[PDB]
């Protein structure tokens, strides 16, 4: 690593400056996770309800796929454990919701 | 506010512990934003391509809606400006991708 890179920085934690999961053709459920050693302590993970997507009749169409849309987000991990004022920056891969995609199928 | 709440905490910045935008029935484009006063400095915003969703024929179906899936994410804002080691925690509302939803339409 670079010795000029600050191994510790100061952070001021005072931040100042209907639902699609059901109506989507690729609907999802939400799973809660709580960890008091993490800040934010509560995060939610979307889980696609079905393998296929919902058609105009309200049935699952397996010729299309529900897939989760994911991104990495930043959180703070208490370090040492239980510390009220000392953390390490951490990244987590979270599923935010689902979308409906045309599958990869070859006409061979 | 609570006077026992730490107004400054230490953070160690050393983190250690095909594509759907095109194939989706609610496809999206990605817009880049760069701000050197923010860490991460580069974020991307999904913009839904269409008002409707793409049908089996490859055409836009306006009886369904493409909508963006959004979440707030945490970033660090340099404070004072240009500081290499002093920040304020900040939250940003980002669009991660789009999904296809049944519209709100009343049969009145």
């Amino acid at each position: 690593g670079d010795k000029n890179f600050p191994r510790t920085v100061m952070v001021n934690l005072n931040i100042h400056n209907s639902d699609y999961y059901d109506r989507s053709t690729s609907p999802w459920n939400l799973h809660r996770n709580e960890d008091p050693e993490r800040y934010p302590s509560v995060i939610w993970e979307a889980k696609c309800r079905h393998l296929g997507c919902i058609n105009a009749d309200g049935n699952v169409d397996y010729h299309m796929n529900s897939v989760p849309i994911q991104q990495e987000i930043l959180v703070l991990r208490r370090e040492p454990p239980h510390s009220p004022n000392s953390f390490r920056l951490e990244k987590i891969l979270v599923s935010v919701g689902c979308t409906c995609v045309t599958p990869i199928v070859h006409h061979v | 506010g609570d006077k026992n709440f730490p107004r400054t905490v230490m953070v160690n910045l050393n983190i250690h512990n095909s594509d759907y935008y095109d194939r989706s029935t609610s496809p999206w484009n990605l817009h880049r934003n760069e701000d050197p006063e923010r860490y991460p400095s580069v974020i991307w915003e999904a913009k839904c391509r269409h008002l409707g969703c793409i049908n089996a024929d490859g055409n836009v179906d306006y009886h369904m809606n493409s909508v963006p899936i959004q979440q707030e994410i945490l970033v660090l804002r340099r404070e004072p400006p240009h500081s290499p080691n002093s920040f304020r925690l900040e939250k940003i509302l980002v669009s991660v991708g789009c999904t296809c939803v049944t519209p709100i339409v009343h049969h009145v």
């Binding site: 934690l13 931040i15 639902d19 934010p40 302590s41 995060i43 935010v96 | 979440q71 707030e72 945490l74």
Partner: peptide
């Protein structure tokens, strides 16, 4: 803001 949490809609809240 002793407790920071996401709600099920992707918004952050001080609890």
């Amino acid at each position: 803001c002793w407790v920071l949490e996401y709600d099920m809609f992707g918004a952050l809240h001080c609890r």
